[PDB]
Amino acid sequence: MRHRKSGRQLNRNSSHRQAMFRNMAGSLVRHEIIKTTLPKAKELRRVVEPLITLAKTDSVANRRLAFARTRDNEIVAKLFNELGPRFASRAGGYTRILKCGFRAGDNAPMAYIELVDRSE
């Protein structure tokens, strides 16, 4: 059974998923849109959107927490300096998933995930 459980395991071990989403969240922050499989998005939301809600309030403690989650000081700075302020009035839902067809090498449901504002 899997009753009332959460979290896709995505055919990986826990270390691997954690590393992968750390990379993928860094990618989404710095590019503001990435293309990934539909199931790996929808798991990025549970990772990225808490980072923006964390970046709402700037403090040393908060930045150190973000750095712990995203071991990337450029990403931390962008969170707290652009995405924090940018989403200050939005109550979650900072990202947007757009189904985009299928991959050619494995027929994988592909999707775009992007920040809702995306400088537009």
Partner: protein
């Protein structure tokens, strides 16, 4: 482990009676670009809902 008589071509056909694919029948048309696409998927030119989302 293994069969004891060769199955017939009739039994191939019967087993495969469930193997047929289903077509979409169901292309949606974007408001602005007017081009066809898979329901809930962006268009080939990057439209969805009738707004550019990719470019």
């Amino acid at each position: 482990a293994v069969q004891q008589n060769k199955p017939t071509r009739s039994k191939r056909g019967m087993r495969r009676s469930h193997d047929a694919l289903t077509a979409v029948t169901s292309l949606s048309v974007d408001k602005t670009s007017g081009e066809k696409h898979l329901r809930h998927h962006i268009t080939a030119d990057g439209y969805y809902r009738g707004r550019k989302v990719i470019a």
